Ligand binder design. Sequence first.
Ligand SMILES: CCCCCCCCCCCCCC(=O)O
Ligand SMILES: CCCCCCCCCCCCCC(=O)O
Ligand SMILES: CCCCCCCCCCCCCC(=O)O
Lengths: 244, 268, 268, 268, 40, 40, 40, 242, 242, 49
Amino acid sequence: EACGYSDRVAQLTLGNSTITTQEAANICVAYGCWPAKLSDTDATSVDKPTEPGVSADRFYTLRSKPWQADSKGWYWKLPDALNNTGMFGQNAQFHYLYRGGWAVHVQCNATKFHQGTLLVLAIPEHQIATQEQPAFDRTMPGSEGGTFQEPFWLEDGTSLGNSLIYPHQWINLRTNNSATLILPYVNAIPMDSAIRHSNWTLAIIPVAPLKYAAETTPLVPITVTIAPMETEYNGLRRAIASNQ
Amino acid sequence: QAAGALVAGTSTSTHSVATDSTPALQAAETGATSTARDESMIETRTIVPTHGIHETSVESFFGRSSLVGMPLLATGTSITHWRIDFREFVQLRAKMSWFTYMRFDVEFTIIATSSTGQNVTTEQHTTYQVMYVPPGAPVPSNQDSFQWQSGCNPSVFADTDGPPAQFSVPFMSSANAYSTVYDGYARFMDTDPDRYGILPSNFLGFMYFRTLEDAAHQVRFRIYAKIKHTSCWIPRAPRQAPYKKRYNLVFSGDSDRICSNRASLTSY
Amino acid sequence: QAAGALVAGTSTSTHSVATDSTPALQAAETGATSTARDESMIETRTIVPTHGIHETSVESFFGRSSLVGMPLLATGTSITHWRIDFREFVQLRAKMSWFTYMRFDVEFTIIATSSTGQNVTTEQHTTYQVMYVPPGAPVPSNQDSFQWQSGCNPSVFADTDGPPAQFSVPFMSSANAYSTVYDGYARFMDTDPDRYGILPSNFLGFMYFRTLEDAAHQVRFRIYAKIKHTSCWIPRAPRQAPYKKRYNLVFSGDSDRICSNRASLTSY
Amino acid sequence: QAAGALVAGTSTSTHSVATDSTPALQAAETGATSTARDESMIETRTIVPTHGIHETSVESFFGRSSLVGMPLLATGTSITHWRIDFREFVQLRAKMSWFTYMRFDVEFTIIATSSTGQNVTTEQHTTYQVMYVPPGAPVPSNQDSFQWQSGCNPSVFADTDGPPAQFSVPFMSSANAYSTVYDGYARFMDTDPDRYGILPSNFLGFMYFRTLEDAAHQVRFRIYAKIKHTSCWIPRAPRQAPYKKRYNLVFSGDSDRICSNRASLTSY
Amino acid sequence: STINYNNINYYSHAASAAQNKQDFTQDPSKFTQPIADVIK
Amino acid sequence: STINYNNINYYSHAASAAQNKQDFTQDPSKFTQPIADVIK
Amino acid sequence: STINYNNINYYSHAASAAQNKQDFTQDPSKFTQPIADVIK
Amino acid sequence: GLPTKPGPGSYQFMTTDEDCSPCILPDFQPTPEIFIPGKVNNLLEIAQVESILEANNREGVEGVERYVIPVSVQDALDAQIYALRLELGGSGPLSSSLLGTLAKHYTQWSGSVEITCMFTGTFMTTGKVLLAYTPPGGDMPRNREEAMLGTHVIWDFGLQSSITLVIPWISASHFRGVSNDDVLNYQYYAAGHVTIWYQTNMVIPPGFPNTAGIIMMIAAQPNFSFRIQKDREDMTQTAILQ
Amino acid sequence: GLPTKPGPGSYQFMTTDEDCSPCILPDFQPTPEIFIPGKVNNLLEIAQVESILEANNREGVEGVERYVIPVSVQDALDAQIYALRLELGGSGPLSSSLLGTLAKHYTQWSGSVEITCMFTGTFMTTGKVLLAYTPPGGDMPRNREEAMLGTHVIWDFGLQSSITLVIPWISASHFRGVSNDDVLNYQYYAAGHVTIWYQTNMVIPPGFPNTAGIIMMIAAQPNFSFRIQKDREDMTQTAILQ
Amino acid sequence: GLPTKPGPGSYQFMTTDEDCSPCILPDFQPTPEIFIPGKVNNLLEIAQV
Ligand SMILES: CCCCCCCCCCCCCC(=O)O
Ligand SMILES: CCCCCCCCCCCCCC(=O)O
Ligand SMILES: CCCCCCCCCCCCCC(=O)O
């Protein structure tokens, strides 16, 4: 009975970082779950955990990517993409175990003279595969992220069309400037190694290509800002940054 | 335990002429599915809920036996085995593709059939032994091997020509649920493609077979698995491309399409 | 549940000499059956109801197994099938001809028998698989075919020389009752005689058979059906002419008569 | 009877800076095991006990069938026997090596298999007799022998090709528990090495086998024993060296080591 | 002349049960007297 | 349209039991309305 | 994690019965602290 | 486990057995039962409904005309109109009726039967007929004087088109066999004869049709029941239908 | 022991049988169930979630672009945009969706369906389209005048990117078969057509893209249910996987 | 007698099966349990040493 008014403006503040947006499409909370810390009954690792708080529970902005006419899509594995950035990365390296949620803010502004539609997805356990089994540079691309080679099949032999079953938002230029997803921790065990297992994959795929009221078109970037939430770490030792 | 949950009903509707309430108008960008109900789009009559939903329940969906293994015992060795996965046959594997995590018990049923060299049925009566060989236990090398004493490993003995063998298994993973998919590596300090997407916690071992006396004819074991007492989490886009390998998700993907093509979008 | 309903009785009567009450006189034009009772036509004595009516109840009438299918599995293919109807054999088909609509459950019993080329019984022990193949599921092409995994389709496995296989089926129609007869067409914008009197809602699919190993000898499957939990509506003039085809009601009708003829109506 | 006992939990800990309480410091000379708990060595979090301990219970540990005997009946005599011990096969024998005294009941299951001279399975249907021959009863000499009347000795008759034979036995020793080990002699005024470590109270006799009609083919008996209703006393260092003989503990002991060797103690 | 049977079904579904031994009383009047203005 | 089954398991372990005939009511909202500020 | 079984034995002798599903709580102290003057 | 002793009859399959078998689709929930007119619970409900007798079964009469027994103006007194041997067993006019084809499925019967005749002549044509039921023991009545000695009804043509002759259950038995099986001597179960005679005569005005007809209908009465189901001998098959 | 009579069905193995079997590891105590988001109890929970239709299935269009039906500035009035035969059965655009691949596992269906379309054009580009559902009986609407006679919705492009067309359950049956099986004549279960038309026209400012698109999504409604599980025809195997 | 339907698993012998079997010496009365030091109920008691 109505679908757009005060839900367009938003401000998220975590630690020493705040994000604002004047053309949002509400906020999506994956599976209706808010990030939360591990229960005494669900837990198994006996050591008292490290809870970094503000030092790690804040927004990090990755290098922007340009949206081009031949662009197929981009993806980032979590925690992979952030494992080597800031205080979050340090904690992830120094500990054998990690658990945490995410606050994802994908942004892409254009003009009322453009048209284009991006599908923003948060895929749990996005195990990928193409005509061959992927190499480390594809499975854990770090902060630079990766690119879809077979976006129609979602790089896993399934389908882009049925991917709406995963938490998602759309950045349809005639409507919005960005997408915001809040993700809880997902795994079949209480905690896991940040360097050996990627829990979520942030995927951004152009479904309706970028067109403009001229043939040129200025550089239109896509920027990803991510914040770790309700984190805890166990198994302290030396820092180990990758599974190589 | 009762399975009487019903589908929803329809109540009567009338004409709307409102300059405020507009349910037909949505905004899919939010990631939310449409809010419109039949009643708000057309003048509807009353329909009392009469349809059940039990056949689409997670339990009913998985609760039936499917072929998962089919080892062949040769006459020269009189012994085979089967790596315990549900990845060898496509039908069950594709059913599981709908979910990320699944916790359940299993009911195995084994049917044994003897054949000739030309694969025609023959009459053959012996007793076979199925032994569970968990990771770390020594594997049998011959029909003779001492490992068949089964001092600790559990075993099932049944006749080749007797009723099928059958038993249940609890939820065995070291994890809290099995994973149908795994975006990570099997080992630390290893980055080999053969170890990506492999979650060792799902592999409980092998099933070894032998006849209690050297086999006269072939003997093939068909292993059926019934998933029961199921719990599922995180639905996924199901598998559309065919499965090429047992331990990874690679697909052929020649023509990038799933449904059929047509001449015009304006005619059938 | 008790089956003690009785037939009616007879009470004593005396002589009538009435210039008003005349029960012997009827008027069949109304479409109503005669109103006259024994007591009003003759001086009757008293008879206490002692006869039961359970053997003529709709349940008792249909509640016994009858042959409905009889597929033959050849040794070259080792696979047959059966289209699920009750129109292949006349005895059951003619019993159902008494009603227009019937709602019921079914109990199938399958008996397997092996024979030689000259159709003489032989000894043969194998396991066969009966698989329910509903409309839309892929059909098996060989004894080998992957469709036999039975990931979703239900299957029954039994021995050739073991007790008969048996199972029950609920009332499956998309309709609210099965129709023994249908004065309409199977499709829209189609007026073909082959599609007249064909109600697709009654066809639930096929039963596919195979032996788990290539067959050594023939093997014939006799499928018996027991109608149970029956509800019947709208009685019909039963079938008098013989059945010529499985999917329509055509008859030969050479001599237009049913009962026997005689020389005179005044002598036997 | 319920098996719900749990493993212990973990409660939260904080920093200690004490000049009196020092749990990390032990003194193993006392023969006592360390007193230190996780909580007193590191800052620990709270963990609620969620793990069970039933699979390590004495009953669960021994409560499964294992091969203990495997007599072979020749076609010329049509009769064998088995001395009742659990010392012929290593797996069960080594499980029992963990305890000094054990009191329990036994469940025997016997599986019979016929073979040819080249040890290949053959079809053979007869009835065999298993007779318990206690110490002092006369032993059968032939398949014919009068001792098979079984006037007092108990017997079990089963088919060669029928289900396995099975029965239970109470705790039979003249002693109050069986001894897995015995530091003494079997007789008085005798000091022979063959009689050292032999406790006659553990030997209840023999099991004699025969076919009810002269055997056509080999026939091998596999005897399985399930220890149940177990009571154990005085745990021992378990057996590490392999077993060479059935009635004593001699071992080869060539290289005096059990675990694997490495180049340095400072590297793997 | 009043056969009363034992219900008892060892299965979950109603279809699994044996035939209904209950006798419902017949009403021939739908077929014998389908006239509106019933006369006797 | 409400199949109520018999529990009864003749074995000691829960794994031995047949399939759960109970119907739990579905809640599609975790997937259909995962938005924070729910509008209707 | 608390498997409670059915006793039921169809035979006369106790030996005939299946394995005891009961869990007795362990007391390691006979082996871990066999010292007379117990210190903690 | 529990000691048992499987006995004779094990693994046997009896088509009339009343056992509960496993359901192949245990979770299936069928469509609701909706309202439909004409529910039938007992085949006896059908037996009690009148159907037309194929009474004019004289050699040479072809369908539809077989349903009308002829009546005509006589030139002779005490004349006969019809004869029918009372049998629910094969071949005869009675066997093709509703009650008769229902009897093709049962082996024993009991009860009273009812025969309603409807006159088809013009409004101006009159007559009086005598309908008689003769209990067994001998043969069919030779004349009307002999026939009137049994159970009978005198019918007067008038505004009431029809008359009913009740054929009461007069048996020594309680139940009769429906067959006349010669090998087992079932003619032991003979039930008698029904004959029709002119009581007066069919008289018409000048020029009117000198021949009219009688349509005979038959139904079972409330004290009627069938016992032991058997197969129809007229429903055959020489090959599988396709 | 206790006298028994094992009957037919003894030793048979039915894949849908609901029996209790012996546990091979009776003493095993599994790991605790921990909290995991997104538990699903009925596949119907998934069916009710919108997925994108592979609607642009014109010969020659390769992936991802197959998900966007094109709309463009017209030079003609009352023009057509799309046609789709309402079938949950194989081949068609509907079959590869979430609801569609779920239907590949069942044989019968019932309920209302919902189609939500989202416009992808620039903010300055406008338009009005008509979406119509035509109950069965005949063929696809030839013109808009014929299409508007059925169940329809008029969509106005504006700040609300999307519109929903409810395809109500209008059936004579209660349940329809999901297949269109030619051998069993399942086209008996035909459900009609959905067509899309220009109500006005897509009009743009000078120099703007003259072609934009519509993304169609589909989901099942709350009164929707499936019956009888069957196998997927598109999930095949030619050899054992390794 | 009582109608039954023996199913799959009939006559199979599972080494971990928990069934009650017939006692071959039903009248036998064993010797009393006497006191012996060091009774062990769980192998975990040993693991902790
Ligand atoms: C006789 C010993 C039985 C042990 C069986 C454990 C069965 C667990 C099956 C788990 C399948 C995991 C899914 C997958 O195949 O990826
Ligand atoms: C093993 C799968 C079983 C499915 C069986 C459905 C049986 C329904 C029989 C309906 C017969 C309709 C009457 C007719 O043949 O015209
Ligand atoms: C059929 C007659 C059954 C009598 C069986 C008595 C079994 C007792 C087994 C005792 C094993 C003692 C341990 C050992 O072998 O040293």
